């Protein structure tokens, strides 16, 4: 009775080890792909199905588990198995233990074994089940990887299951055409072309290679005829196309590659792909090719390397040879896409100078592949809908519907079974096979099918292999299929033309699966070859190993953990993860950006991303000195394979956080002119043949700033309320006054003085309290003139109440001020709005009552509705500012309050083995904070500035020449002077406004 699967007897056993495991295997070979519960749980059932058979042979020992693997395992799978497990008892290097909890496994297995068993042994057994897991996910990982879904599902699993014939038998739109879409597109495409040239050179071209003896070098010239420097060249501008990419902000429509097109054109790079499509439709190349497999020896090597490879290189490689063709002639059809559809004027002239320069090269293939040879090989390498009609063209077909094991059809043509009457036309589908005999034209019974078609029978397609010989019996262009528990039947064509075709397709369906993995065994392989130092961490600071005191992480953030996330860390380090050369972290240079000052300096930054962008190159071997000056030299190319892939991502960054630095910064090198210089002069050592474009791009921003300091006017969308006048005429900034300029006006102007202000605003000034420090007028030019406004506007509306002796007037003054605050609550204005309240809960003014009572009772409500929004701590305020949309001007009070709550909340740094950690996570928090700052920065107001009233905001100094002590106490004592105590007489003050006191008013004109 073998152990069950659930298990009935032990079930909670078996579902909570493999799932949570499996999900980092996953991660191990597709990075790109997502996890899926759902996914991993049907993994888990086919892990453990195969844990099964192995301990049916009861082994004992870890030699007795080895025989049943090279028995049971098909080929090469079990080669390559058993070359894994026992890396597992060799103790020798590897990435990681049995990510597959060892000591969970270890008991159950002595249970379904049914005795004792060493550790050695069950190390080898999971060992196995690892390297199957992996297996699984790396193919079907292929699959969503080529279909571009980027997500894993339970139900693509079973997919890539029917597509092998090893793992069956072991377990039995869009019309829309945008900019930026079609970058992203072709760059999936490019990856999948260059994953298919490697997969001809690494795979088909290396045992050409290899075996020298044979196959000399220009032996192998006329098969693949540069098809490594098409490689070479899609890498780099697949490259050029990932950077240009990265340095794009979110403040731009799509990315600027037409400069790069601009120069592989220039040095035309597309050369190698004319010499490519002729050398691969020439008339005499299928004859050399297959004139290449049946000379002495080749035809015994190609068998020695793989079983059914053979076939593959006769039958499907000249296929995937055609390629580099259709996708070279993407490219012009996708240029001209660029022209079409760019939003650049700059990018458009590069996008015509890449066209014209590749003009002679289109011309070319255009005219090579319209060949009458040429274009016949071009058509024919090139839902659901179809299979209804092919099944319904069947006549009592007893198989299930075709869509139950079959997602597509190959090809339909027609074929001779040997020992059968009548030519059977022939549906091709994948995973199936069809079979039908023509009645086309022959009379039928009234009431009976009409069907052209009938087919006798049909095949599963599994596990099937050909065989043919041009023999000299009545047999030709034909081959071989052993059908389960039967006799093979041979299938002939009618000529060699038809023969490649279906041999095409057949042997494309079983042996794509053998590539694919073959492919990821060799790629693996070279990465581990490849023996890579790091920078030696004393002439490079930022090379020093991570460890838990000089950098951390936080678990909670990530549960994948995914994007790496930094809590803390030495500046070398975060500076080291600011341009991390593995990924790129834009979130984090934001950040970083916006709070690096609150413990480090700017000089002292410019100093260090030098350091990081200076890398001191490995030192040459003896053998490289004697050779440095003379023939067959190393040229260093081991050295290259690392320092290109390093240096390319590191000082790439190392320009993106300066790109950003002098975009969203120039007010730093605004404030040190020395910093700027230095900026200038360390651009301009910096060389290199695509360094030219990232150097334009730092010194056109900073070009592009110095003319904007030096000497606006910006235009808004219709349409500008016309401007409210006032008892005064216009122009007469003399008589300018509170109760004379226009009440809505008044807002009017004050809202747009206060917007501006807090637009101006930076992240910064924000940020270490650098506002408190007695360097405040450096770090917070913006914050304090706002702050200083706030002041002197409360003020002078306290002073024009205290000042107005007589009550008559004061009462319209107060009155008036609270209409002013009306219009600051329809303009979303909330700043102006509490700078009345302030004015209203100002010692001089809260306490007269005599005032305060003369007032409408409707304006008595709009201001205790004010007094409303500081209770609950701002809770009315807060709760009304999230159903407000900009323009707005918001209280500007509560973003402080928070944030000092936040460097009070959370130690600067963080202690690890006596070091001391730059607790970034403030930092961060902080940002977090600022965020909703900039949220309300973007609209302005739709509002005709007026200068006149403008400036005379801009001039309010109720103070004079006073001190804040000395103006508040004058305040104060006017109150007791206009307003004395209740046992004393109220006096009857004279009116100083000579001007109707009566308001127009708070009312917008028709026009």
């Given at each position: 009775?073998?152990?069950?699967?659930?298990?009935?007897?032990?079930?909670?056993?078996?579902?909570?080890?493999?799932?949570?495991?499996?999900?980092?295997?996953?991660?191990?070979?597709?990075?790109?792909?997502?996890?899926?519960?759902?996914?991993?749980?049907?993994?888990?059932?086919?892990?453990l199905?195969?844990?099964?058979?192995?301990?049916?042979?009861?082994?004992?020992?870890?030699?007795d588990?080895?025989?049943?693997?090279?028995?049971?395992?098909?080929?090469?799978?079990?080669?390559?198995?058993?070359?894994?497990?026992?890396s597992?008892i060799?103790?020798?290097?590897?990435?990681?233990?049995?990510?597959?909890?060892?000591?969970?496994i270890?008991?159950?297995?002595?249970?379904?074994?049914?005795?004792?068993?060493?550790?050695?042994?069950?190390?080898?057994?999971?060992?196995?089940?690892?390297?199957?897991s992996?297996?699984?996910?790396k193919?079907?990982?292929?699959?969503?990887?080529?279909?571009?879904?980027?997500?894993?599902?339970?139900?693509?699993?079973?997919?890539?299951?029917?597509?092998?014939?090893?793992?069956?038998?072991?377990?039995?739109?869009?019309?829309?055409?945008?900019?930026?879409?079609?970058?992203?597109?072709?760059?999936?495409?490019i990856?999948?072309?260059?994953?298919?040239?490697?997969?001809?050179?690494?795979?088909?071209?290396?045992?050409?290679?290899?075996?020298?003896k044979?196959?000399?070098?220009?032996?192998?010239?006329?098969?693949?005829?540069?098809?490594?420097?098409?490689?070479?060249?899609?890498?780099?501008?697949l490259?050029?196309?990932?950077?240009?990419?990265?340095?794009?902000?979110?403040g731009?429509?799509?990315?600027?590659?037409?400069?790069?097109?601009?120069?592989?054109?220039?040095?035309?790079?597309?050369?190698?792909?004319?010499?490519?499509?002729?050398?691969?439709?020439?008339?005499?190349?299928?004859?050399?090719?297959?004139?290449?497999?049946?000379?002495p020896?080749?035809?015994?090597?190609?068998?020695?390397?793989?079983?059914?490879?053979?076939?593959?290189?006769q039958?499907?490689?000249?296929?995937?040879?055609?390629?580099?063709?259709?996708?070279?002639?993407?490219?012009?059809?996708?240029?001209?896409?660029?022209?079409?559809?760019?939003?650049?004027?700059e990018?458009?002239?590069?996008?015509?100078?890449?066209?014209?320069?590749?003009?002679?090269?289109?011309?070319?293939?255009?005219?090579?592949?319209?060949?009458?040879?040429?274009?016949?090989?071009?058509?024919?390498?090139?839902?659901?809908?179809?299979?209804?009609?092919?099944?319904?063209?069947?006549?009592?077909?007893?198989?299930?519907?075709?869509?139950?094991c079959?997602?597509?059809?190959?090809?339909?043509?027609?074929?001779?079974?040997?020992?059968?009457?009548?030519?059977?036309?022939?549906?091709?589908?994948?995973?199936?096979?069809?079979?039908?005999?023509?009645?086309?034209?022959?009379?039928?019974?009234?009431?009976?099918?009409?069907?052209?078609?009938?087919?006798?029978?049909?095949?599963?397609?599994?596990?099937?292999?050909?065989?043919?010989?041009?023999?000299?019996?009545?047999?030709?262009?034909?081959?071989?299929?052993?059908?389960?528990?039967?006799?093979?039947?041979?299938?002939?064509?009618?000529?060699?033309?038809?023969?490649?075709?279906?041999?095409?397709?057949?042997?494309?369906?079983?042996?794509?699966?053998?590539?694919?993995?073959?492919?990821?065994?060799?790629?693996?392989?070279?990465?581990?070859?490849?023996?890579?130092?790091?920078?030696?961490?004393?002439?490079?600071?930022?090379?020093?190993?991570?460890?838990?005191?000089?950098?951390?992480?936080?678990?909670?953030?990530?549960?994948?953990?995914?994007?790496?996330?930094?809590?803390?860390?030495?500046?070398?380090?975060?500076?080291?993860?600011?341009?991390?050369?593995?990924?790129?972290?834009?979130?984090?240079?934001?950040?970083?950006?916006?709070?690096?000052?609150?413990?480090?300096?700017?000089?002292?930054?410019?100093?260090?991303?030098?350091?990081?962008?200076?890398?001191?190159?490995?030192?040459?071997?003896?053998?490289?000195?004697?050779?440095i000056?003379?023939?067959?030299?190393?040229?260093?190319?081991?050295?290259?394979?690392?320092?290109?892939?390093?240096?390319?991502?590191?000082?790439?960054?190392?320009?993106?956080?300066?790109?950003?630095?002098?975009?969203?910064?120039?007010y730093?090198?605004?404030?040190?002119?020395?910093?700027?210089?230095?900026?200038?002069?360390?651009?301009?050592?910096?060389?290199?043949?695509?360094?030219?474009?990232?150097?334009?791009?730092?010194?056109?921003?900073?070009?592009?700033?110095?003319?904007?300091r030096?000497?606006?006017?910006?235009?808004?969308?219709?349409?500008?309320?016309?401007?409210?006048?006032?008892?005064?005429?216009?122009?007469?900034?003399e008589?300018?006054?509170?109760?004379?300029?226009?009440?809505?006006?008044?807002?009017?102007?004050?809202?747009?003085?206060?917007?501006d202000?807090?637009?101006?605003?930076?992240?910064?000034?924000?940020?270490?309290?650098?506002?408190?420090?007695?360097?405040?007028?450096?770090?917070?030019?913006?914050?304090?003139?706002?702050?200083?406004?706030?002041?002197?506007?409360?003020?002078?509306?306290?002073?024009?109440?205290?000042?107005?002796?007589?009550?008559?007037?004061?009462?319209?003054?107060?009155?008036?001020?609270i209409?002013?605050?009306?219009?600051?609550?329809?303009?979303?204005?909330?700043?102006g709005?509490?700078?009345?309240?302030?004015?209203?809960?100002?010692?001089?003014?809260?306490?007269?009552?005599?005032?305060?009572?003369?007032?409408?009772?409707?304006?008595?409500?709009?201001?205790?509705?004010a007094?409303?929004?500081?209770?609950?701590?701002?809770?009315?305020?807060?709760?009304?500012?999230?159903?407000?949309?900009?323009?707005?001007?918001?209280?500007?009070?509560?973003?402080?309050?928070?944030?000092?709550?936040?460097?009070?909340?959370?130690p600067?740094?963080?202690?690890?083995?006596?070091?001391?950690?730059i607790?970034?996570?403030?930092?961060?928090?902080?940002?977090?904070?600022?965020?909703?700052?900039?949220q309300?920065?973007?609209?302005?107001?739709?509002?005709?500035?007026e200068?006149?009233?403008?400036?005379?905001?801009?001039?309010?100094?109720?103070?004079?020449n006073?001190?804040?002590?000395?103006?508040?106490?004058?305040?104060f004592?006017?109150?007791?002077?206009?307003?004395?105590?209740?046992?004393?007489?109220?006096?009857?003050?004279?009116?100083?406004?000579?001007?109707?006191?009566?308001?127009?008013?708070?009312?917008?004109?028709?026009?």
């Open positions: 009775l073998p152990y069950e699967f659930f298990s009935e007897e032990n079930a909670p056993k078996w579902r909570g080890l493999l799932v949570p495991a499996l999900k980092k295997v996953q991660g191990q070979v597709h990075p790109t792909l997502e996890s899926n519960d759902d996914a991993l749980q049907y993994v888990e059932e086919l892990i199905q195969l844990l099964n058979m192995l301990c049916q042979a009861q082994p004992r020992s870890a030699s588990v080895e025989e049943r693997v090279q028995k049971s395992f098909p080929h090469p799978i079990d080669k390559w198995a058993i070359a894994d497990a026992q597992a060799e103790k020798r290097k590897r990435r990681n233990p049995l990510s597959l909890p060892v000591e969970k270890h008991p159950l297995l002595k249970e379904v074994l049914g005795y004792k068993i060493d550790h050695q042994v069950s190390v080898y057994i999971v060992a196995v089940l690892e390297y199957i992996a297996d699984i996910l193919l079907v990982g292929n699959y969503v990887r080529n279909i571009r879904h980027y997500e894993i599902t339970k139900q693509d699993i079973k997919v890539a299951m029917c597509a092998d014939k090893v793992l069956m038998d072991m377990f039995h739109t869009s019309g829309e055409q945008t900019y930026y879409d079609l970058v992203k597109a072709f760059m999936a495409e990856r999948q072309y260059i994953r298919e040239l490697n997969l001809i050179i690494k795979v088909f071209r290396e045992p050409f290679v290899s075996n020298s044979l196959f000399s070098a220009n032996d192998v010239e006329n098969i693949f005829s540069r098809i490594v420097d098409i490689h070479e060249l899609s890498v780099k501008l490259g050029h196309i990932e950077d240009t990419v990265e340095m794009t902000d979110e731009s429509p799509h990315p600027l590659v037409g400069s790069c097109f601009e120069d592989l054109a220039e040095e035309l790079a597309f050369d190698p792909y004319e010499s490519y499509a002729r050398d691969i439709l020439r008339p005499g190349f299928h004859d050399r090719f297959l004139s290449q497999l049946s000379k020896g080749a035809a015994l090597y190609l068998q020695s390397i793989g079983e059914g490879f053979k076939e593959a290189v039958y499907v490689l000249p296929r995937l040879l055609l390629a580099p063709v259709y996708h070279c002639l993407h490219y012009f059809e996708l240029l001209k896409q660029l022209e079409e559809k760019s939003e650049d004027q990018d458009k002239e590069c996008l015509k100078q890449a066209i014209t320069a590749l003009l002679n090269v289109q011309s070319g293939m255009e005219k090579i592949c319209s060949k009458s040879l040429a274009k016949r090989r071009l058509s024919e390498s090139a839902a659901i809908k179809k299979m209804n009609e092919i099944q319904k063209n069947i006549d009592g077909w007893e198989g299930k519907d075709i869509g139950q079959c997602n597509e059809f190959i090809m339909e043509g027609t074929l001779t079974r040997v020992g059968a009457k009548h030519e059977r036309h022939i549906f091709l589908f994948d995973g199936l096979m069809i079979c039908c005999k023509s009645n086309h034209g022959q009379p039928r019974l009234p009431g009976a099918s009409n069907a052209e078609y009938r087919l006798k029978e049909k095949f599963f397609m599994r596990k099937v292999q050909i065989n043919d010989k041009d023999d000299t019996n009545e047999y030709k262009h034909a081959f071989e299929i052993i059908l389960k528990d039967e006799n093979s039947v041979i299938f002939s064509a009618k000529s060699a033309e038809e023969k490649n075709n279906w041999m095409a397709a057949l042997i494309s369906l079983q042996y794509r699966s053998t590539l694919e993995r073959m492919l990821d065994v060799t790629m693996l392989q070279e990465e581990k070859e490849e023996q890579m130092r790091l920078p030696s961490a004393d002439v490079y600071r930022f090379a020093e190993p991570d460890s838990e005191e000089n950098i951390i992480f936080e678990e909670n953030m990530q549960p994948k953990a995914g994007i790496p996330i930094i809590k803390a860390g030495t500046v070398i380090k975060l500076i080291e993860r600011l341009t991390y050369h593995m990924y790129a972290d834009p979130n984090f240079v934001r950040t970083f950006l916006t709070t690096y000052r609150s413990f480090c300096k700017p000089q002292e930054l410019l100093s260090l991303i030098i350091e990081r962008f200076e890398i001191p190159e490995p030192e040459p071997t003896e053998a490289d000195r004697i050779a000056e003379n023939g067959d030299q190393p040229l260093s190319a081991e050295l290259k394979r690392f320092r290109k892939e390093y240096i390319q991502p590191v000082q790439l960054r190392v320009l993106n956080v300066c790109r950003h630095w002098v975009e969203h910064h120039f730093d090198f605004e404030r040190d002119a020395y910093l700027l210089q230095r900026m200038e002069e360390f651009i301009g050592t910096v060389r290199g043949k695509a360094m030219k474009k990232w150097v334009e791009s730092i010194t056109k921003i900073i070009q592009r700033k110095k003319i904007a030096d000497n606006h006017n910006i235009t808004f969308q219709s349409s500008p309320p016309t401007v409210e006048w006032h008892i005064s005429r216009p122009g007469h900034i008589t300018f006054d509170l109760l004379t300029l226009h009440p809505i006006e008044i807002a009017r102007q004050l809202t747009l003085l206060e917007s202000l807090y637009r101006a605003v930076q992240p910064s000034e924000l940020v270490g309290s650098v506002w408190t420090k007695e360097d405040k007028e450096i770090n917070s030019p913006n914050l304090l003139k706002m702050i200083r406004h706030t002041t002197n506007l409360t003020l002078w509306f306290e002073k024009c109440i205290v000042e107005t002796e007589n009550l008559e007037e004061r009462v319209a003054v107060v009155s008036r001020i209409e002013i605050l009306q219009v600051f609550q329809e303009l979303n204005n909330f700043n709005v509490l700078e009345v309240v302030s004015a209203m809960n100002s010692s001089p003014v809260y306490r007269l009552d005599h005032t305060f009572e003369q007032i409408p009772s409707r304006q008595k409500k709009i201001l205790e509705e007094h409303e929004l500081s209770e609950d701590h701002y809770k009315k305020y807060l709760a009304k500012l999230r159903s407000i949309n900009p323009p707005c001007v918001p209280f500007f009070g509560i973003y402080l309050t928070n944030i000092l709550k936040t460097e009070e909340g959370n600067e740094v963080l202690k690890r083995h006596g070091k001391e950690l607790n970034f996570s403030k930092r961060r928090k902080v940002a977090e904070i600022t965020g909703e700052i900039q309300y920065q973007n609209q302005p107001y739709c509002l005709r500035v200068s006149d009233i403008k400036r005379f905001f801009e001039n309010l100094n109720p103070m004079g006073s001190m804040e002590k000395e103006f508040t106490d004058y305040l004592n006017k109150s007791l002077e206009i307003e004395p105590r209740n046992p004393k007489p109220l006096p009857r003050f004279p009116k100083k406004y000579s001007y109707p006191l009566k308001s127009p008013g708070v009312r917008p004109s028709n026009p």
